[PDB]
Every structure is written in structure tokens, then in C-alpha cells.
Nucleic acid binder design. Structure first.
Lengths: 114, 151, 66
RNA sequence: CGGCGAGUAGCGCAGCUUGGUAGCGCAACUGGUUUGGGACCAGUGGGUCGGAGGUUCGAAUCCUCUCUCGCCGACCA
RNA sequence: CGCGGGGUGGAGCAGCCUGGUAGCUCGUCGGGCUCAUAACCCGAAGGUCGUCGGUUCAAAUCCGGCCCCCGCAACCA
RNA sequence: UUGAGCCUUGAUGUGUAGGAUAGGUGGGAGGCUUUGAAGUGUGGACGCCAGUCUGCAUGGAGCCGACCUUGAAAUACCACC
RNA sequence: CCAGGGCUACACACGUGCUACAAUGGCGCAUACAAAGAGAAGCGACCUCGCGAGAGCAAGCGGACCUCAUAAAGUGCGUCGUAGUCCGGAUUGGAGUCUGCAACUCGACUCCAUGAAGUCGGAAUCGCUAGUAAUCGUGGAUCAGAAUGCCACGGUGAAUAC
């Protein structure tokens, strides 16, 4: 379909198909389909048009793909221009939740190139 | 080892139909001590092969053993200077026990869906001896017969 | 135009979810069924969402509560 | 001096002829093996073509100019 | 201006005559081996044979052409 | 001793379909035999050892044409090679 | 003596682990079978509230009786269908709970969102002979809080030794 901007999976059940949107995982998607009155075991191909529309206003209640990314990136930019401790580690690129850096943190630091 | 020549174990027979040779086979298929998981695979693969083979379970199973059951294998023995490979005759208790190992490692490399489908495919095409499990047995007989000069 | 070198440019019907059913000419093939359109897009409210950036000291007053 | 011939990774050598992406060995570096070193196994990095300017869409290559170092002779009364 | 010959995985060799049934040696990888390296045995990946036409129930070999390398003997604008 | 040319009795080359050590087409579809047969014994020869052949002669006056499936016609007579 | 900071830094190298790369699995629902141990400025039912971590109320217990405490792999049924995928859970954002004078440096945990590397690992190298290896959970000490470590406990349970 085109749920909340993108959503073209098929052959998947609707709880898993809905999780393609940036902003919904397994438990938010269950909250969508419960409020839409849709069974979770249906594919998107077997969805009528009278069901796809009542998901679009249902998914519109949660901040999703478009305006979520600019929300998250501004909050990082709120920290990085604040000069705080978490913003300072966001600048250099290093783990910000207070975990070790002597041997680990390959995720923040990328590969060990030299 | 050095000293002890220990006698072997006491395997209890298979619960579906009493056979220690099938009961030894489910141990080689087992992992992490999960025997009920492995028995689920064996019975579901033996019945879906017994339909394809026509023969009933055990005789459909044991005919697929002789196509992977070897008879000679190489060992690396040193007596004079540098060491080479001598082909030795495989003792019979090991002989089918080595065959069961080659099957379940061939079925684990199989790119099918489930282990029941994988093992039944491997155990069937070994009854027509076309699988990779017989190709292990053919390639141990090639390097044994390449080294037939040592006896 | 030249003949026989262009795609089949026929008249189709486009129906959005907001109710705007419109008649266009396109090479979709027939019966395009939309979700959003010009009078369905949130260009009048949805553009202003993160423009409302929110406060920080009111969050403190939502935690001090006194 | 003239003529020819070189300059390429730390070193020694290819590629140039015949234009689009430069290899080779050693060395280096990281790991392994060993009590440790060497040796040996894996891995991996490094140059951007002496310099300058042209030609060309594009130059290590093609031209020219100096630079550096080779080789040849710079003779007859 | 003429006699016949060689061109075959990255690299080298047979099977050409007597037509069908593309094999080896090394180097690369994967095993086995060993305290480790070397060696060694098994299996595999890489070419449809310099190129263009012929016929037959089937050709990568045979039939001519055409190209490169020959090994020679030939050659008086 | 011996090539090489040459005269000539005589000799040669089953992929498979599937009886077929048969070179290409046929001419013509019957040669044949009691101026003593099919089947055989063997000395051999030949050999992808697949398979065919002939000679003291046993047997000793009958064997066998396209039929059989064949891409083909049958040293059953056959020409030139 | 005190406050604050450091012992937690981070171009990198090593050791020991944990979790993975999935279908012998994941997820959903239902359901079975342990041992050992701790507990009073402590363990904390039941009930109520909260999606949850938890909170409130609060019996009982210095304990074979009370609480921690529903063992989990298992087994049934459904789904997924070999995909970086319903695998994996790092990282990061937001919102919280608890402990404690205090959680910025620098705690654990929950919720929502995110969803990276990884598709079985070079040369090498380790452990293990039977209730062992492997795998699954539980408890304890230290401790206001803070373990994948340590020390214990049971569940399932091999292969092989010429």
C-alpha cells in the first residue's frame, strides 16, 4: 500500500508489514491493528480498500517516518549545540550512555582502521 | 588410552521400534542433549522416506547405510622415517558408526527447509547412492586405493 | 506528434482517500487509486508540526509541579 | 663539451615503446609459533612516477626544458 | 615469390596419421598429513583449441582459405 | 633381402537403430544345384578379440529375394573401384 | 581533615567471557517435571493501582510450616519459509521506576522508538573419558544499589578411545 508514506511489503502479516514504517515496532503495530479492528493474521494483499484507509488515520496518531527523523536529529542537534556532555560525545563520535571505550565501542567508532 | 581397554556402553533400544542401530543414529543427530528434538526429526524423516522408498522404516534405513558404509580408510602411521598413509580395514562396529556420521553431516550441509526434509533427502538419494554422503565414501576409497601399496 | 512511437496516453480516473475523484490522462493503464492528493495533503497543518519546537522550561514545570 | 640513457614505495628492479587503473622482491607493520630471538606461517599498509611547461577530453607514458647520475669521444698536424 | 611444420586453462606438453570416448605437468585454492615448514596422496576451480567458410547420422582433430611466429632453401625494375 | 609402381585369382572400414567385420549407388528383386546340399569338426588366419571367412574332409542333391526393426542396401549374382 | 574530580580516559594490541549469525530455530498461546540456598534496621504473600520496571496496603516468618519462588530447556497447537529476513540485538532518541544525602562525569531496570556489525570465522589454539562434554534454568556470598564474574545446585544428556 502506501501507509504513512512508504509501506510496500506484501506476503506478510499486517503486524510485521506495518513495522516497515520508521516509528512503529511490534507493540505499536499491535496497537494500530487493534484500534483499526483488523485481525493481525491477514496479508496486505487480502486487505480491502475499506481497511487500508482506516489504518492511515490510525497510523497518523503517532509520529512516524517523516516528522520523526527531523525530531530525533533536532534533539541530537539540541545536545550538540548545547555543549553538554552527551552533546560532546555526539560530536567526537563515541558512546554517550556511559560505557567503556578502552577496548570496545566499535559501533560508535566504526572499524579499527589503523 | 595407554592402559585401559574398556568395554563399550549400554544403549537402550529405540522406543518407536526396538533397534540399537537406530538408537545410535539419534545420538549422532542429537545436539545439546536434546534427544526428544532429535527423535522428532528421525521419525518424521523415516516415515516420509518409507513412503518414497516403499519399504518399511528400518529396512528402508539400513539399505541406505551400505552405500555410505566404508570398508577401508587411511591412517597416518610412522614406522621408518617420515610418515605416510596406510589403508586399514574398518572394524564392523565402527564401520556403520562412521557411516551414520557422514550422513548427518551431509544432511546438515543440505540447503533444504527442515532437518526432517534434509535428512530424508540425504538418506533417500544415498539409497540410489548419488548424494554427497556416498561421495565421502567414494573419496575415502580413492585415497585408500591410491595408497594400496602399503599393507 | 509522430505516430506509433509514443506510449498509450489514455484518459484514466484517479480517486483519492479524501474524496477528490479526478479525471486525468495518463499511461497508468486505467483506474489509479490514490491515498493522498492536493486537497488531501497536510500542507496547511502538517508542515507546522516540528515548527512547533516545544519548550524546555515548561517540562521543568511539568516536573516541579509547584 | 655532444650523444645516449637512465631517474618509479625505505632499497633494488619492471611498466613507458604502442596514452585512461603502476607492479616486483626485500624491508616495514599486525597477529601467530617458541622460554625468548631468528627462521617460518598468515595478514596488511605504503608511491602516485626527479622537477617544470606544453600537447590531449585525459600524460608514469607523447614532446620540450632545465636538474641529477651513468656511458661513449672531445681527433689529425 | 614456394615446400611441408608449430599456434591447445595463468604457464608448458600429449593424443593429429587409424575421425566421435579435450587428458597431464606446475602454479593457484580445499582436504588429509606434521612439534612446524618442505615434500607427499585425494578432490576441485580455471580453456570448447589464432580467426573465417565445408560436409556428415555426431567434430575441439580432417578439407581449404586468412593471420602471426617460423625453420630453411629461393630472389637481376 | 627388399620397397615402390604395376598385372590378377583374392581381399576391406559393427556409432546407433538393433540379426547383420556391409565403400558409395543400384542394376535388378532372385541367384542357387545332383560335371554330388543346410547345418558342422578344426588347422589356422584376422581381431575395437566384436565377430566373419575359407582348405584334407565329415556331413554329403538342397540352401534361400527385398520380409524383421533399418538412416542403407544384403561378396544369394553384381559393375567399377 | 574536607569538598570536587579520578580509579570508568581511548588512534590501538592482547587475555578471559557473554550474546549471536538462526528452522535441531524465532514468535504467540496452553501446559508438565527440580535440587540447593537465603531471610529481621531482613524476606515480603494476598489484595489494589500501573503496559511495565514498580507503588500502596500489608499478613506471615528467625523459619521442613512464611516469603523470595511462576524453574527453564521440554511438550502440544498455530505462524514464519531461508530472507540480513518475525534472525541478531548493539547503538541512539524520548518517557519512566527504584536505591541512595546525591545517578553530570559514572548505577541497575522498565516502556516506546531505533534496529548496526554479523550468514559459522586466516595462521593458529583450548577444554573434555560419563551423568562427563554440550545445553537449560535456579540459588548464594560481597552488597543501600550495582555482575555476562565467582562459588554452588539440579534438568535434559551424547560422541569416541584401534
Amino acid at each position: 500500500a502506501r501507509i504513512a508514506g512508504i509501506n510496500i511489503p506484501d506476503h506478510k502479516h499486517a503486524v510485521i508489514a506495518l513495522t516497515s514504517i520508521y516509528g512503529v515496532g511490534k507493540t505499536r503495530s499491535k496497537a494500530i491493528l487493534a484500534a483499526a479492528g483488523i485481525a493481525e493474521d491477514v496479508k496486505i494483499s487480502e486487505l480491502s480498500e475499506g481497511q487500508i484507509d482506516t489504518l492511515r488515520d490510525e497510523v497518523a496518531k503517532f509520529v512516524v517516518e517523516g516528522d520523526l527523523r527531523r525530531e530525533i536529529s533536532m534533539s541530537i542537534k539540541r545536545l550538540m549545540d548545547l555543549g553538554c556532555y552527551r552533546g560532546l560525545r555526539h560530536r567526537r563520535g563515541l558512546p554517550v550512555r556511559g560505557q567503556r571505550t578502552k577496548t570496545n565501542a566499535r559501533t560508535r567508532k566504526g572499524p579499527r582502521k589503523p | 588410552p595407554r592402559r585401559r581397554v574398556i568395554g563399550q556402553r549400554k544403549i537402550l533400544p529405540d522406543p518407536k521400534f526396538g533397534s540399537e542401530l537406530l538408537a545410535k543414529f539419534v545420538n549422532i543427530l542429537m545436539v545439546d542433549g536434546k534427544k526428544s528434538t532429535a527423535e522428532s526429526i528421525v521419525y518424521s524423516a523415516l516415515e516420509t522416506l518409507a513412503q518414497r522408498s516403499g519399504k518399511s522404516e528400518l529396512e528402508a534405513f539400513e539399505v541406505a547405510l551400505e552405500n555410505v558404509r566404508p570398508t577401508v580408510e587411511v591412517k597416518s602411521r610412522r614406522v621408518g622415517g617420515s610418515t605416510y598413509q596406510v589403508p586399514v580395514e574398518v572394524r564392523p562396529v565402527r564401520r556403520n558408526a562412521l557411516a551414520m556420521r557422514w550422513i548427518v553431516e551431509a544432511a546438515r550441509k543440505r540447503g533444504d527447509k527442515s532437518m526432517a526434509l534434509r535428512l530424508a533427502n540425504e538418506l533417500s538419494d544415498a539409497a540410489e547412492n548419488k548424494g554427497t554422503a556416498v561421495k565421502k565414501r567414494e573419496d575415502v576409497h580413492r585415497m585408500a586405493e591410491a595408497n594400496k601399496a602399503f599393507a | 506528434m509522430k505516430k506509433d512511437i509514443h506510449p498509450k496516453y489514455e484518459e484514466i480516473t484517479a480517486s483519492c482517500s479524501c474524496g477528490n475523484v479526478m479525471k486525468i490522462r495518463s499511461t497508468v493503464g486505467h483506474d489509479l487509486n490514490l491515498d493522498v492528493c492536493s486537497k488531501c495533503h497536510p500542507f496547511f497543518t502538517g508542515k507546522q508540526r516540528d515548527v512547533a519546537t516545544g519548550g524546555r522550561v515548561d517540562r521543568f514545570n511539568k516536573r516541579f509541579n509547584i
